[PDB]
Design a protein around this ligand. Structure first.
Ligand SMILES: C[C@H](CC(=O)O)C(=O)C(=O)O
Ligand SMILES: [Cl-]
Ligand SMILES: [Mn+2]
Lengths: 429, 18
């Protein structure tokens, strides 16, 4: 279907086909050399240049080499710099360039490539949709929003643009506004809309406005394979891990860690209170839009398996105690943090990002009334000096209606059924 | 940003190639 050959390339199609045949047979090393020879002999040929880039691309996959892929990324750009490049080939080459740049984490580089594509093909709205994804990947929601507004102004029923626009509105706390876009976009069935992120946030937005249809969308997302269940809606998962909202210490196998937390709870409390009194700026307000109302702040000692050295200066005995337990300090998909919550606080029902962690809560200062946590269909409360354990990949919700502050210590651990190989290789979250 | 308690970012992991 795509027209990849300009006038000159048509005359050398026999040589170009012979090289491409080598690539399709899996003789990648022979294919690279053959296209390199064609590039050497026909330095202006776009198809020869693209063949070289495709072979370098395949070779990077074979050898799992970032450096080989960087070479391919440059050759894809070289295609675009040649004279008389067919429009189909120009688009294919720069699109793959941007895709591979994103794979390498070159998000700024991918954005420049996508901006070039949009400038070269001003009527291609799918390219503008790709550009919006580029802005979203660097965290530039403002520019992403402008891009999808431009798309929706031309094609109002673009489902891909709708879900991404609705995602941005929802991230901006424009909850009611986001629902029709997320809903209509998912319902369009357009390529790219069947995504767990959009089912996740549509249901959450509906929950926040009191729309009872929220769980029909969790149920459909489960039926389409995005969620392990309607209750457990994490999106960064390892399949097969035991799934239950509440855990006992013995069920986790982390009984030595639990004993240490409970035996030594007062020193953990006292260091948290000292920071509250003398270094309160170390407690940072929750910043994921998870509160309906109230005050909730956290003082984080470990995140992504990395010790925060300045934070541990403020709780040195607690950090010294916890260093004996790699099951938590090495949990690169979890945190270790103090969590203070004040009266008048309601945390929206929400789910964590991954099923690969379990969460321990050690009670430190718990008012006698008013504080409770629901996980799935079960509500519990904290006790001073005692550990609660739940899987926060299940929907959970917290209220604080006491007459004074509530302080807990949160210790994330690797899910106990994850092998050591998985604990070393899983991407940090 | 980072996905700590929630799933609010477009992606929660960072891309580092192979
Ligand atoms: C709201 C709670 C934190 C807290 O109660 O301090 C929560 O979301 C979690 O522990 O995952
Ligand atoms: Cl030439
Ligand atoms: Mn939570």
């Amino acid at each position: 279907k795509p027209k990849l050959l300009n006038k000159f390339d048509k005359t050398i199609k026999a040589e170009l086909d012979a090289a491409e045949k080598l690539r399709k047979r899996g003789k990648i090393e022979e294919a690279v050399n053959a296209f390199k020879e064609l590039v050497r002999k026909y330095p202006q040929s776009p198809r020869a240049r693209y063949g070289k880039a495709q072979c370098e691309d395949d070779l990077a996959e074979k050898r799992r080499s970032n450096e080989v892929l960087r070479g391919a990324i440059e050759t894809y750009q070289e295609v675009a710099s040649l004279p008389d490049v067919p429009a189909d080939l120009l688009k294919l080459s720069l699109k793959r360039r941007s895709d591979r740049q994103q794979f390498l984490g070159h998000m700024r580089g991918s954005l420049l490539t996508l901006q070039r594509l949009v400038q070269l093909f001003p009527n291609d709205t799918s390219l503008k949709n790709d550009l919006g994804v580029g802005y979203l990947l660097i965290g530039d929601n403002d520019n992403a929003k402008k891009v999808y507004e431009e798309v929706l102004s031309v094609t109002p029923n673009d489902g891909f643009a709708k879900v991404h626009y609705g995602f941005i509105l929802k991230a901006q706390n424009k909850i009611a506004e986001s629902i029709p876009y997320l809903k209509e976009g998912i319902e369009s069935g357009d390529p790219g809309t069947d995504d767990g992120r959009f089912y996740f946030h549509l249901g959450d937005a509906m929950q926040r406005v009191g729309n009872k249809e929220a769980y029909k969308w969790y149920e459909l997302g489960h039926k389409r394979g995005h969620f392990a269940s309607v209750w457990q809606r994490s999106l960064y998962n390892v399949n097969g891990l035991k799934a239950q909202p509440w855990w006992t210490p013995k069920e986790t196998g982390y009984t030595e860690l639990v004993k240490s937390l409970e035996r030594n709870w007062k020193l953990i409390r006292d260091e948290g209170l000292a920071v509250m009194d003398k270094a309160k700026g170390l407690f940072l307000p929750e910043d994921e839009n998870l509160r309906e109302k109230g005050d909730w702040s956290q003082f984080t000692l470990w995140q992504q398996g990395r010790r925060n050295e300045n934070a541990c200066k403020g709780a040195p005995k607690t950090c010294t105690l916890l260093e004996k337990f790699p099951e938590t300090t090495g949990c690169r998909r979890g945190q270790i943090k103090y969590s203070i919550m004040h009266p008048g606080t309601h945390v929206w029902p929400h789910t964590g990002p991954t099923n690969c962690r379990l969460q321990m809560h050690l009670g430190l200062v718990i008012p006698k009334e008013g504080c409770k946590i629901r996980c799935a269909n079960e509500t519990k409360t904290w006790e001073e000096g005692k550990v609660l354990i739940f899987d926060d990949s299940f929907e959970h919700e917290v209220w604080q209606d006491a007459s004074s502050f509530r302080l807990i210590f949160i210790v994330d651990v690797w899910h106990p059924e994850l092998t050591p190989q998985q604990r070393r290789s899983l991407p940090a979250i | 940003g980072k996905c700590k308690d929630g799933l609010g970012e477009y992606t929660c992991t960072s891309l580092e190639g192979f």
